[PDB]
Ligand binder design. Structure first.
Ligand SMILES: N=C(N)c1ccc(CNC(=O)[C@@H]2CCN2C(=O)[C@H](NCC(N)=O)C2CCCCC2)cc1
Ligand SMILES: *[C@@H]1O[C@H](CO)[C@@H](O[C@@H]2O[C@H](CO)[C@@H](O)[C@H](O)[C@H]2NC(C)=O)[C@H](O)[C@H]1NC(C)=O
Ligand code: NA
Ligand code: NA
Lengths: 249, 27, 10
């Protein structure tokens, strides 16, 4: 996260760290959607341009974390993966269309003050919250700058940007399965997700029922926090039918 | 279910430092 | 720079 702030304790209890076993490093962000299901970006697990093709046994999910590097004894819970499910129409060749993946945990995770799942939106929550100017929140342990790393989880609030403005900021073709967020150069305020934030959640707090919903997944951008550029997110509600199908099994 | 309600915030009726910025944006 | 994690997690 570039131009964010340290998260408060228990501020994002659905935050998941995707951790590579060997070498021991941060792979991606992710999110807790139930006691056994974790949501992430498909490119965190499969990205042929960079020779990325992780299997279940190559990683661990670390839940309830605040510190990036330390082992949070009595706080975080580390889980092993039973199965990875990548969207069958995930487009890694061009624009990361349908950049979404589900991960089934071997054992259910126990909820605590630091571990709690985020909601997934219904058609109405999505229609009412996914509006240009409405702010969401992005969290992660990614790069603090484009060209270092935070000690603790970082947070940034960012407004959803109008579809024409997103499309006009880039040469990449944008689909209905993505949305962009961030401030314009004129707005004053700054902020963006960056490398290592991928797979993390873009959340919004419903003013109707006061619950947090995951509206986006950190997907891509061109650099980080560049003027006239915006971060792109997987549109979760557009792919909820695939999510439901995999969970229903 | 109890999704999206944080034990240290909504469950305690405590607000985090910036959530009001999100609410104020929902015009 | 990542602190070691208990052996039980492989
Ligand atoms: N600024 C952001 N919001 C932001 C930027 C980057 C990331 C990390 N995600 C990735 O690296 C994924 C795999 C390919 N990719 C990219 O972002 C590429 N840029 C790579 C790059 N360094 O800009 C991006 C270039 C345009 C075509 C789609 C892929 C997450 C968030
Ligand atoms: C990514 O890695 C997987 C292995 O984990 C590859 O899957 C194999 O695919 C071949 C045919 O393409 C099958 O006959 C094997 O049985 C597969 N193994 C498993 C475990 O699924 C996959 O092709 C790799 N590359 C891409 C781009 O997906
Ligand atoms: Na364009
Ligand atoms: Na920008």
């Amino acid at each position: 996260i570039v131009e964010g702030s340290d998260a408060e304790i228990g501020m994002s209890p659905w935050q998941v760290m995707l951790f590579r076993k060997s070498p021991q490093e941060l792979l991606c962000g992710a999110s807790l959607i139930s006691d056994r299901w974790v949501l992430t970006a498909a490119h965190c697990l499969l990205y042929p341009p960079w020779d990325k093709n992780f299997t279940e046994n190559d990683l661990l999910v670390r839940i309830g974390k605040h510190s990036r590097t330390r082992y949070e004894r009595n706080i975080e819970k580390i889980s092993m993966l039973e199965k990875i499910y990548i969207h069958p129409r995930y487009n890694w060749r061009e624009n990361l269309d349908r950049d979404i993946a589900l991960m089934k945990l071997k054992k259910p995770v126990a909820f605590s003050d630091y571990i709690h799942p985020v909601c997934l939106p219904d058609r109405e929550t999505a229609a009412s919250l996914l509006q240009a100017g409405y702010k969401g929140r992005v969290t992660g342990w990614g790069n603090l700058k484009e060209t270092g790393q935070p000690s603790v989880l970082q947070v940034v609030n960012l407004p959803i940007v109008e579809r024409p403005v997103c499309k006009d900021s880039t040469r990449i073709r944008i689909t209905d399965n993505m949305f962009c967020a961030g401030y314009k150069p004129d707005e004053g305020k700054r902020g963006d997700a960056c490398e290592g934030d991928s797979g993390g959640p873009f959340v919004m707090k419903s003013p109707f029922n006061n619950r947090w919903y995951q509206m986006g997944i950190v997907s891509w951008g061109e650099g980080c926090d560049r003027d006239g550029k915006y971060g792109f997110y997987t549109h979760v509600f557009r792919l909820k039918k695939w999510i439901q199908k995999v969970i229903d099994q | 279910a109890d999704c999206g309600l944080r034990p240290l915030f909504e469950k305690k009726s405590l607000e985090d430092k910036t959530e009001r910025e999100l609410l104020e944006s929902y015009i | 720079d990542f602190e070691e994690i208990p052996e039980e997690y492989l």
